[PDB]
Design a protein around this ligand. Structure first.
Ligand code: VJ2
Ligand code: VJ2
Ligand code: CL
Ligand code: CL
Lengths: 125, 5, 125, 5
């Protein structure tokens, strides 16, 4: 209806609780493997944040897998930084990790993150 | 909080 | 880290995608029954929005149930309005539904919704 | 969008 009222902080309050569930390992349903480093997560949050995970978990066979192995060229620290961003809206971008974060975001299909990385690199040139 | 969206 | 940058619209963009998954019945894992009316949802979203669902899905036995039956006194329209709020931040509060919405929010343990209903009722007295 | 939180 056009007569709805809206609670400004609701989406942020939901995301905070999804990160608390991840930290306590509550109802996590997939393990993402990056060069033998393992990360537990919720398939719905991964799909909501990435073009790659949206394609994987809408596939009739891959939707039922409990383990997903990423390309061996993907950096575990870069993946960890992006997983934290998915669950908090905060991106830990530093001189020492920006190249790995950008390459991981290109693979995961997160367009706005790729664009921000490109702008930060161009400013230091 | 609440607002008119 | 204290050096993070933040994307303002991220939490709202995630919530929009969680509602799109619900509308297409993608990776929904529970049916909520309200007086023979059935509602499909994601347990993680329900827990993130309600004290009652947080208690139910952290229980060692109830966490594995695929069907949850609510008290027969709960109004299906009131529940539908609150489920839509969980997935969008928008609450369809009207003169004809406010009493049912408030009673449902008290049962579901959604404090700020109860408080807003009370304020809207007090203004019409 | 990006800001300093
Ligand atoms: C390419 N891409 C992106 O750059 C970014 C995606 N998601 C985030 C939240 C990071 C975003 N969206 C928009 C602006 C900024 N940030 C992203 C998400 C998806 N999934 C879905 C898309 C459409 N419909 C559904 Cl149901 C889902 C889900 N779940 C796909 C691609 C994404
Ligand atoms: C009472 N109550 C509430 O009034 C409201 C709860 N959630 C919403 C998002 C509606 C809210 N929170 C704060 C301000 C405004 N709105 C609510 C949510 C929970 N779950 C959790 C609590 C703590 N930690 C975890 Cl991991 C979860 C989860 N999932 C419980 C009670 C709630
Ligand atoms: Cl598997
Ligand atoms: Cl069951």
């Amino acid at each position: 209806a056009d007569s709805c009222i809206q609670f400004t902080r609701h989406a942020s309050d939901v995301l905070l609780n999804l990160n608390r569930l991840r930290s306590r390992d509550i109802l996590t349903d997939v393990v993402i493997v990056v060069s033998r480093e393992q990360f537990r997560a919720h398939k719905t949050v991964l799909m909501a944040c990435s073009g790659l995970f949206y394609s994987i978990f809408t596939d009739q066979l891959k939707c039922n897998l409990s383990v997903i192995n990423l390309d061996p060229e993907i950096n575990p620290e870069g993946f960890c930084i992006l997983l934290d961003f998915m669950y908090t809206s905060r991106l830990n971008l530093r001189e020492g990790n920006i190249m790995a974060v950008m390459a991981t975001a290109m693979y995961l299909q997160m367009e706005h993150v790729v664009d921000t990385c490109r702008k930060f690199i161009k400013a230091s040139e | 909080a609440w607002v008119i969206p």
